[PDB]
Amino acid sequence: ELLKPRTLADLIRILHELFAGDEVNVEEVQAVLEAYESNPAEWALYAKFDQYRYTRNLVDQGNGKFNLMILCWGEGHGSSIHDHTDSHCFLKLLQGNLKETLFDWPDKKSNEMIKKSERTLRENQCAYINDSIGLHRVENVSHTEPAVSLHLYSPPFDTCHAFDQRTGHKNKVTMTFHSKFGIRTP
Ligand SMILES: [Fe+3]
C-alpha cells in the first residue's frame, strides 16, 4: 500500500520500507518519489551549493540499501556523461529544471558519442536511469535559476565512469560528498 509521502522524512521512512527486501520495484519507487511535493524548508539543510560545480549532499544511507542525496546545481553547472555502476538511479527535481541527455554505450572503436535524445526535467518530476537503458549527462542550463535534485541509487556506489564525448573513452571517477547529514565534509 503506497501512500503519499507527507514530508521528506516521511518519504525516507517509506523508502526504507520499499528497500526492506533484496529487489527493487522501480515503478513503485518512482511513483512515491514523484508523489512527494518538494518542500524547500524540509531540505534546506542539505542544499549546500559550491560556486564552481554541482555538489552532492548525502541525506540518508538507506540502512545500506541505497544512497539518498541532494545535488545542488549552480547556474550552468552540469555533469559528465556517466554510467551508474550497475545500480538503479532515480532523479527527482526539487527546484528548477535540468536537461537530461541520453547516450548509448560506446563501441570499442573511438568515435564521437552522439546523443540519442534529450529532455527537460521539471520541478517535482522523477526520472529513472540504469546502465541497461544507457548513459546520460545532467545539466542545469539556466542562467538565472539554481537547481536542486534528489537522487536515489541502489545499491549505493562510490565510483562510476565519465565518458569523453569525442571518443567514448571512459575513466573511473570517485564520487565525493560535499556534506553528509547536513555537515560539511571536506
Ligand atoms: Fe546520472
- What residue segments make up the domains of the chain, in order of their start? 1-186
Give the residue numbers of the binding site for Fe cation: 82, 84, 136
Beginning with the edge strand found earlier in the chain, give each strand of the sheet holding 81-82 in spatial order: 115-121, 98-103, 135-139, 81-82, 159-163, 170-174
CA 135 to ligand 1 centroid distance, Å: 8
Annotated binding site: 82, 84, 136
> E strands, 28-146, where?
55-60, 67-73, 81-82, 88-95, 98-103, 115-121, 126-129, 135-139
For 120, counting Cβ atoms within 10 Å of its Cβ (0-12 exposed, 13-18 middle, 19+ buried), the class is exposed
Query: How many Å lie between the centroid of ligand 1 and the Cα of residue 126?
Result: 13
The grid cell for 32 is: 512515491
Pairing of strands 135-139, 88-95: unpaired
Give the single-character DSSP code of 34: H
SS3 call for 60: strand
For 186, counting Cβ atoms within 10 Å of its Cβ (0-12 exposed, 13-18 middle, 19+ buried), the class is: exposed
CATH architecture observed for domain 1-186: Sandwich (2.60)
Q: Could you tell me the distance, in angstroms and rounded to a whole number, from the CA of residue 17 to the centre of ligand 1?
A: 24
Question: Considering only CA atoms, which of 28, 26, 56 is closest in space to residue 148?
Answer: 56
